[PDB]
Amino acid sequence: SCAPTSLPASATELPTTVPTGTVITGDYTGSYRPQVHYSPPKGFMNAPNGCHRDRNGTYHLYYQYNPLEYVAGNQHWGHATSDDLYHWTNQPIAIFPPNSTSQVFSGSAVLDPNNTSGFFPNTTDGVVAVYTLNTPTLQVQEVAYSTDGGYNFTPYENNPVLSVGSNQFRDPKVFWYEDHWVMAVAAANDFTIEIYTSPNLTSWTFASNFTHHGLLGLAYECPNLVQVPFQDDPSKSAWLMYISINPGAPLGGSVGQYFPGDFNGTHFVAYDSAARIADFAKDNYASQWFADTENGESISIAWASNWQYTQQVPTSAQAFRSAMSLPRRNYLTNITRLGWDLVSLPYDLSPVVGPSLLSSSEANSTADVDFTNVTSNAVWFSLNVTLPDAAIQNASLISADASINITFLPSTKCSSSDSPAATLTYFYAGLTNGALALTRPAASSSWGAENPFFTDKFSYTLVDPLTSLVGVFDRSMLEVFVNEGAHSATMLVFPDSPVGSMKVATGGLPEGTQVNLQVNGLESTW
Amino acid sequence: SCAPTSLPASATELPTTVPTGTVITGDYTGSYRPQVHYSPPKGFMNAPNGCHRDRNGTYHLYYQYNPLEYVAGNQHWGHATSDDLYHWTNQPIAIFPPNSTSQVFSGSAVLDPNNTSGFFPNTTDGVVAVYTLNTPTLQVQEVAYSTDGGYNFTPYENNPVLSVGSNQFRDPKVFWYEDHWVMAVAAANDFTIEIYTSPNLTSWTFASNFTHHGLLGLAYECPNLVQVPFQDDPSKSAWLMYISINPGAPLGGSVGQYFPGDFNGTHFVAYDSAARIADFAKDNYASQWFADTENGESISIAWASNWQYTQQVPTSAQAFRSAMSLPRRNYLTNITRLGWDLVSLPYDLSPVVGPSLLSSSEANSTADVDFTNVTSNAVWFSLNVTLPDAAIQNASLISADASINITFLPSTKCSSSDSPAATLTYFYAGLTNGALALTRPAASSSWGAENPFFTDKFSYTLVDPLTSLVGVFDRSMLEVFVNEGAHSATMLVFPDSPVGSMKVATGGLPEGTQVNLQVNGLESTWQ
Ligand SMILES: *[C@@H]1O[C@H](CO)[C@@H](O[C@@H]2O[C@H](CO)[C@@H](O[C@@H]3O[C@H](CO[C@H]4O[C@H](CO)[C@@H](O)[C@H](O[C@H]5O[C@H](CO)[C@@H](O)[C@H](O)[C@@H]5O)[C@@H]4O)[C@@H](O)[C@H](O)[C@@H]3O)[C@H](O)[C@H]2NC(C)=O)[C@H](O)[C@H]1NC(C)=O
Ligand SMILES: *[C@@H]1O[C@H](CO)[C@@H](O[C@@H]2O[C@H](CO)[C@@H](O[C@@H]3O[C@H](CO)[C@@H](O)[C@H](O[C@H]4O[C@H](CO)[C@@H](O)[C@H](O)[C@@H]4O)[C@@H]3O)[C@H](O)[C@H]2NC(C)=O)[C@H](O)[C@H]1NC(C)=O
Ligand SMILES: OC[C@H]1O[C@H](OC[C@H]2O[C@H](O[C@]3(CO)O[C@H](CO)[C@@H](O)[C@@H]3O)[C@H](O)[C@@H](O)[C@@H]2O)[C@H](O)[C@@H](O)[C@H]1O
Ligand SMILES: OC[C@H]1O[C@H](OC[C@H]2O[C@H](O[C@]3(CO)O[C@H](CO)[C@@H](O)[C@@H]3O)[C@H](O)[C@@H](O)[C@@H]2O)[C@H](O)[C@@H](O)[C@H]1O
Ligand SMILES: *[C@@H]1O[C@H](CO)[C@@H](O[C@@H]2O[C@H](CO)[C@@H](O)[C@H](O)[C@H]2NC(C)=O)[C@H](O)[C@H]1NC(C)=O
Ligand SMILES: *[C@@H]1O[C@H](CO)[C@@H](O[C@@H]2O[C@H](CO)[C@@H](O)[C@H](O)[C@H]2NC(C)=O)[C@H](O)[C@H]1NC(C)=O
Ligand SMILES: *[C@@H]1O[C@H](CO)[C@@H](O)[C@H](O)[C@H]1NC(C)=O
Ligand SMILES: *[C@@H]1O[C@H](CO)[C@@H](O)[C@H](O)[C@H]1NC(C)=O
Ligand SMILES: *[C@@H]1O[C@H](CO)[C@@H](O)[C@H](O)[C@H]1NC(C)=O
Ligand SMILES: *[C@@H]1O[C@H](CO)[C@@H](O)[C@H](O)[C@H]1NC(C)=O
Ligand SMILES: *[C@@H]1O[C@H](CO)[C@@H](O)[C@H](O)[C@H]1NC(C)=O
Ligand SMILES: *[C@@H]1O[C@H](CO)[C@@H](O)[C@H](O)[C@H]1NC(C)=O
Ligand SMILES: *[C@@H]1O[C@H](CO)[C@@H](O)[C@H](O)[C@H]1NC(C)=O
Ligand SMILES: *[C@@H]1O[C@H](CO)[C@@H](O)[C@H](O)[C@H]1NC(C)=O
Ligand SMILES: *[C@@H]1O[C@H](CO)[C@@H](O)[C@H](O)[C@H]1NC(C)=O
Ligand SMILES: *[C@@H]1O[C@H](CO)[C@@H](O)[C@H](O)[C@H]1NC(C)=O
Ligand SMILES: *[C@@H]1O[C@H](CO)[C@@H](O)[C@H](O)[C@H]1NC(C)=O
Ligand SMILES: *[C@@H]1O[C@H](CO)[C@@H](O)[C@H](O)[C@H]1NC(C)=O
Ligand SMILES: *[C@@H]1O[C@H](CO)[C@@H](O)[C@H](O)[C@H]1NC(C)=O
Ligand SMILES: *[C@@H]1O[C@H](CO)[C@@H](O)[C@H](O)[C@H]1NC(C)=O
Ligand SMILES: *[C@@H]1O[C@H](CO)[C@@H](O)[C@H](O)[C@H]1NC(C)=O
Ligand SMILES: *[C@H]1O[C@H](CO)[C@@H](O)[C@H](O)[C@@H]1O
Ligand SMILES: *[C@H]1O[C@H](CO)[C@@H](O)[C@H](O)[C@@H]1O
Ligand SMILES: *[C@H]1O[C@H](CO)[C@@H](O)[C@H](O)[C@@H]1O
Ligand SMILES: *[C@H]1O[C@H](CO)[C@@H](O)[C@H](O)[C@@H]1O
Ligand SMILES: *[C@H]1O[C@H](CO)[C@@H](O)[C@H](O)[C@@H]1O
Ligand SMILES: *[C@H]1O[C@H](CO)[C@@H](O)[C@H](O)[C@@H]1O
Ligand SMILES: *[C@H]1O[C@H](CO)[C@@H](O)[C@H](O)[C@@H]1O
Secondary structure, eight states, rough: OOOOOOOOOHHHHOOOOOOOOSOOOOOOOOTTTSSSSOOOOOEEEEEEEEEEEOOOOOOEEEEEEEEEEEEEOOEEEEEEESSSSSSOEEEEEEEOOTTTOEEEEEEEEEEEOOOSEEHHHEEEEEEEEEEEEEEOOOOOOOOEESSSSSSEEEEOOTOOOOOOOOSOOOEEEEEEEETTEEEEEEEOOOOOOOEESSSSSSSSEEEEEEESEEOOOOOOOEEEEEEEEEOOOTTOEEEEEEEEEOOOOSSOOOOEEEEEEEOOOOOOSSSSHHHHHHOSSSOOEEEEOSSSOOTTEEEEEESSSTTTTTOOTTTGGTTOOBBBOOOOOOOOEETTTTTTEEEEEEOOOOOGGEEEEEOOOOOOOEEEEOTOOOOOOOOOEEEEEEHHHHHHHOOOGGOTEEEEEEEEEOOOOOOOOOOEEEEEEESSSSSSTEEEEOOOGGGGGGHHHHHOOOEEEEEEOOOOOOEEEEEESSSEEEEEEETTEEEEEEEEESSOOOEEEEEEEEOOOTTTTEEEEEEEEEOOOO | OOOOOSOOOHOOOOOOOSSSSSOOOOOOOOOTOOOOOOOOSSSEEEEOOOEEEEEOOEEEEEEESSSSOOOSOOOEEEEESSSSSOOOOEEEEEOOOOOTOOEEEEEEEEEEEOOSSSSTTTOOOEEEEEEEOOSSSOOEEEEEESSSSSSOOOOOOOOSSSSSSSSSSSEEEEEEEEEEEEEEEEEEGGTTTEEEEEESSOOHHHEEESEEEEEEEEEEEEEEEEEEEEEETTTTEEEEEEEEOOOOTTTTSSSEEEEEEOOOOOEEEEEEEEEESSSSSOOOOOEEEEEEOOOOOEEEEOSSSSHHHTTTTTTTTGTTTTTTTEEEEEEEEETTTTTTEEEEEEEGGGGGEEEEEEOOOSSSEEEEEEEEEEETTTEEEEEEEEHHHHHHHHHHSSSSOEEEEEEEOOOSTTTOOOOOOOEEEEESSSTTTEEEEEEEEEOOOOOHHHHHTOEEEEEEEEEOOOOOOEEEEESSSSEEEETTTTTEEEEEEOOOEEEEEEEEESSOOTTEEEEEEEEEEEOOSOO
């Protein structure tokens, strides 16, 4: 009746030697184990790597993987595949360190259909991985190739392909621009993204530096240079430099930021000197965009944790630490006053959407949704609010108490007290007009209350009224999307008791305000 | 006796009409009332305004003041004076709105000793206030002058002195540059600081725009363009554009940010495109630098609150809402890797420093300091940690458990739950190496736990090891300064029970590590 809080030792015990060419079996039943998010069968996972789509339409996810412990280290590339970015199949480890004292750090993977590399005389489905090898004294860029569709990789003969004599030089993102390969790589502790060019992915020539932009934190990491379409006009696009920083994010630890601008194949130039943060909570880092997607599609995935507590979260008794974000569709838009904005929406959820739990059109009411019978313990919800045009043209018509309150409440059935696991509060007017508060109350979680970095409360302030809100709760994760993904937050929750229900309350809304609420159970992908 | 948690209605009841030419009496005895920070006798206070030092060395603090309510509105300039920025004397209201439908928003004040303005034919001690007047439809810059040393102000005859036909155009900061006046003013919702020039403070000419720099939030506010000396070399200085943003700070609501650069009298040019945040917590906003200070002394003060909860904090039963930060001495330094850094240190605390409560040289120990006998309920502490040169040249010598833990604990004597009111945790090594955590636990405060914006936990990560930590606790406020003020945080606390003691624990420190801990009670400045 209740998901296990602890698993048998056979499920959690890690091997003392790394398995080659065999899939690692995982038990995906833990009470904190997400059912629609990727997480590794066992061990520690961080940043996504080598994200690309085959011509056969299979999505390849690789990731920083420690197969020997529940903390960072011994980095290999784990591998999982999906046709829909929700139903994941675990694959054997894809990239190994040469020995016990070296590590495979982050990188990217590209299709080389025209065999510019020379690794692929007999296939048009060749994959090239470009990644950082970490030694005690250096970080260098290395190349590996795969003829079997990205499952098994062979080291390049003349590795390494790029060194600057530094041990802070990592996370290469390779892509095709017109007539050559581009590499974005971080000179991490110099707050510089170095852009290199190559015709064959093995011989790299310096092109330009992008330095000391936006928030510095303590290091630039996981650079992504991508073309992102406009939300309102698919035919228009702009280039985006996305940079992860860790430590030293404003909320503490790790965070991503972005710069809209122009790229001409050698040089990126930001449109302005403004700093812009992607997510208004703490648990979204090291976004990578999928290479070789179908026309127009900006698809990204991120690691749904924070370096300040990722190695301490109480999920190791359930055979894992860390999960990816929902896969995201990305756009650029202009929002009122602020201008440039990175839009993030969940990638098509239809394959995991189960039956309706509640449909309601009631304004100024409270809706109670029990989902103790939803075995996934995962729900999707949508809330649309349409203010009368009177209230839109004159905001002072709105009463000070006009609000939306969403609370996730502990199960009575599966228990061990009454604190919500998660809250969302939005005010249309009053003293905190446009303020959205997202909380994981300290009282709900013994582990959370004690961890000195596990921040309880997050906020974003809208200029425009809240018109749309989409949410996914998945056992130990809440993701929310506001105003068609204009604003986005990823938040981990570790409540003592599993979530059994949610309450959605609207109050003090102007006469003629329309409210539409839909809640659906999600189907487990494991 | 224990400090009262509620005051008599005569102490908290506000008048229905604004008093002119009379000092408003305050009761400064409340359990949350700071004893070494400025707060208004009663009513609601926000941003500091018109901050300047007169030639006789008196510091003038003005502030955004609602004399009629415990929330924002009806803005006047309140006034207080000090010789030392700790012993404050309340003064009558200094600037009034012309009528019931207008408000006096933020601004600055300058000495005009050479009478460039023409207001001062018979004095060299003339003060000029330049401030935003808010009407329902416009924000315009106005001038007022004072011949009595900044206590009573007269409107300029030909007000306003600057309009752009906007209702989002405010917070002028005026200063002398070589041979002319400069005004920095915010085109708030366009994320632009407009720089204007004037020979007489009444006629303003556009010079330049500084636009879309750093964090945008929802508005640019309270610009300050100041020359800040180098911490290591007083003969060197650089210009700093300091901008407040609200709402839309990363931690929510309000925060300040800065840009080191060059100013040539017309144009400010940032040295780089980097964004830099001043304070790593939530309760420091609208910093203003004092005009006409001695030498190159950079002196600032800020409002110690956050717009997300400032109007809801549970201090109105004690006749006030909001307090200023400690006054601060400012410098520029280079810190390892990050480079440019705004240094913030408490302005000379010696006039409020009372007797020693503890001096200890013990490493790897826990010191318990009771201060239930300190009537101010305010303490200063200094913690110096010197790692051996061995640990400096090879960091892997430091054990994963090498840490500093400071907890402020509720009084047993003045009880209204055992949770600390505030914590500071620093790790030298391990999985979160260099991470400093500052917390106001939800369990300590019923009001705090319920407020959806009152964040419990804040952090900054050092590259260099922590060598110095200075702290001031003052009833409802904690300020911490790290590595000679390289990093700074201001945090409000509203514990159910007043703080009675602090514990300082060091642990796991390398052999030969020196620790020096000093704790002193502070003397109340309110007589
Ligand atoms: C494109 O950008 C790249 C990346 O910025 C440029 O390459 C860098 O060039 C700069 C000079 O402009 C180099 O910086 C110098 O480094 C010297 C050596 O310092 C190192 O060695 C020291 C002693 O062993 C060591 O203490 C130091 O570490 C410390 O400083 C770090 C500074 O960030 C700090 O993070 C650490 O915590 C630590 O305290 C260094 O490892 C130094 O003597 C000079 O004063 C100067 O700082 C960088 O090393 C280069 N970086 C890389 C990786 O290439 C390149 O020039 C640009 N190219 C073009 C064409 O524009
Ligand atoms: C120095 O900086 C100030 C402050 O930025 C600047 O004044 C501003 O100028 C801008 C641009 O003219 C003004 O913006 C306009 O505002 C009106 C509404 O009153 C809008 O209708 C205009 O919209 C157009 O541009 C939009 C851009 O998003 C488009 O969406 C739209 O389709 C229109 O084409 C436009 O936004 C702004 O109001 C003023 N602000 C103030 C406070 O005066 C000044 O011009 C700069 N001076 C110099 C010399 O550079
Ligand atoms: O080199 C010493 C350091 O190595 C490991 O941490 C490395 C690096 O990991 C993180 O960076 C990213 C992004 O999160 O993660 C992969 C590696 O897993 C990198 O390619 C990528 O930039 C952190 O963000 C960095 O702070 C850190 O330097 C090891 O696990 C550490 O314990 C440490 O010893
Ligand atoms: O103008 C309409 C606006 O008036 C009031 O809010 C004004 C303004 O107050 C704050 O700005 C600063 C800095 O905090 O405070 C003073 C005013 O006391 C300004 O000179 C300065 O920029 C807030 O930060 C702003 O967001 C706010 O606009 C009133 O309280 C509002 O409801 C509104 O009517
Ligand atoms: C957001 O707005 C900016 C400014 O209005 C847009 O940049 C403009 O792009 C149009 C064509 O789409 C040009 O005609 C203008 O000259 C540009 N303005 C400036 C000053 O650069 C930008 O395209 C918009 N972005 C999105 C995502 O809609
Ligand atoms: C921090 O370091 C920077 C970089 O060295 C210093 O900037 C230089 O300052 C010197 C003298 O002031 C100039 O001669 C150089 O041309 C400057 N270089 C750059 C790139 O700006 C800066 O002075 C230092 N700041 C502090 C506070 O020490
Ligand atoms: C491990 O591999 C790295 C990278 O090739 C190499 O530099 C190092 O010498 C190897 N270690 C040993 C002990 O062979
Ligand atoms: C890549 O091309 C460059 C010059 O075009 C050349 O130096 C290098 O040998 C090439 N590498 C391969 C493996 O073809
Ligand atoms: C791209 O533009 C930069 C200047 O912004 C220029 O120096 C560089 O050569 C350009 N590259 C190409 C290939 O046009
Ligand atoms: C908006 O309605 C308020 C009353 O709630 C009124 O005082 C104000 O003048 C109106 N403004 C406009 C733009 O109609
Ligand atoms: C909601 O309640 C408010 C206050 O009671 C009322 O004025 C308003 O008409 C109601 N709104 C709707 C949409 O029912
Ligand atoms: C809200 O409107 C959007 C428009 O795209 C629609 O997709 C969604 O079904 C609506 N949500 C609800 C709860 O009706
Ligand atoms: C209030 O005074 C301001 C500034 O002098 C003026 O613009 C406005 O007309 C006055 N309003 C009323 C209602 O008298
Ligand atoms: C006053 O005049 C003196 C020289 O006579 C000049 O040095 C100083 O800068 C002037 N001060 C102001 C504030 O105008
Ligand atoms: C001018 O100043 C002196 C000294 O302050 C004073 O005695 C005299 O009366 C003043 N005259 C005027 C016009 O104020
Ligand atoms: C200030 O000086 C300007 C230019 O010299 C002039 O236009 C203006 O009338 C002066 N104002 C006063 C009050 O002297
Ligand atoms: C100040 O610098 C700007 C550009 O940085 C220049 O256009 C302007 O003429 C300069 N003004 C003076 C007073 O030198
Ligand atoms: C602690 O170190 C500071 C410098 O950071 C020094 O000035 C101060 O005297 C030291 N404190 C004590 C009590 O020695
Ligand atoms: C640093 O100390 C470690 C042990 O803590 C030792 O193994 C290593 O050899 C030392 N390296 C240097 C810098 O001497
Ligand atoms: C301080 O508390 C932290 C947080 O739990 C702990 O990890 C550390 O070992 C403690 N050290 C001391 C000085 O008590
Ligand atoms: C502090 O204690 C640690 C172990 O907890 C010990 O290794 C070290 O020698 C001690 N250092 C000092 C300075 O007493
Ligand atoms: C997880 O927690 C449950 C109680 O909720 C225990 O039964 C189990 O042993 C594990 O501690
Ligand atoms: C996985 O965790 C279980 C329970 O803590 C252990 O039995 C096992 O040794 C491994 O640590
Ligand atoms: C502060 O607590 C005191 C108890 O001493 C009460 O008098 C007052 O109501 C407030 O709660
Ligand atoms: C202030 O008001 C409080 C009300 O809670 C009293 O309890 C207290 O004694 C004082 O009158
Ligand atoms: C000032 O606050 C006190 C205590 O809450 C009240 O007695 C008075 O009416 C006013 O609210
Ligand atoms: C404020 O209003 C009070 C009554 O509420 C009067 O007594 C007073 O004169 C002033 O008008
Ligand atoms: C002092 O002036 C103020 C504002 O003009 C008034 O509140 C009061 O009536 C007296 O005239």
